[PDB]
């Protein structure tokens, strides 16, 4: 299992278990994704509302599918592949939730799916604005690498 994978998946279930502690309303002001001209330069919000799980599907659903294929990505192609992801995926699916819906969304879906869209293309080849910005995401990426690798494979016994 991976390093990533599992600082990540560790990270959301102690932000859920703490939003039932006490208050979610801290958690949730400080990580939603700016609302607000000033929380534009607030820089962790592009990323950090994935952090955030709305219910026990919500987060049971997110981490199941994200363990197993954020694990097949660390596991394949390193830590530092999945924490790009992580990221990319992370503030373009927000960048593109914000602009449909305002800032109120939250979790890891939009992650889980550039994730799956990446293990697919990748898979395919060498083998809820959200969820298809960041399924976008996932099959545009891995179709760039895809492409890198068998590159450089070309100079290779």
Not at 26 to 45: F, N, T
Not at 68 to 97: H, N, P
Request: proline share 2%.
């Amino acid at each position: 299992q991976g390093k990533i994978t599992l600082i990540l998946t560790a990270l959301c279930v102690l932000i859920y278990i703490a939003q039932q502690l006490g208050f979610e309303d801290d958690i949730m002001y400080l990580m939603h994704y700016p609302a607000y001209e000033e929380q534009d330069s607030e820089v962790w919000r592009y990323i950090s509302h994935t952090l955030v799980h709305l219910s026990n599907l919500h987060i049971l659903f997110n981490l199941s599918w994200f363990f197993i294929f954020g694990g097949m990505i660390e596991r394949t192609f390193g830590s530092v592949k999945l924490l790009m992801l992580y990221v990319v995926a992370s503030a373009i699916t927000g960048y593109v939730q914000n602009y449909v819906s305002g800032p109120a969304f939250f979790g890891l879906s939009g992650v889980v799916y550039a994730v799956l869209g990446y293990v697919f293309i990748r898979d395919k080849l060498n083998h809820n604005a959200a969820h298809i910005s960041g399924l976008i995401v996932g099959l545009i990426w891995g179709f760039i690498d895809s492409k890198l690798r068998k590159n450089s494979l070309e100079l290779v016994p």
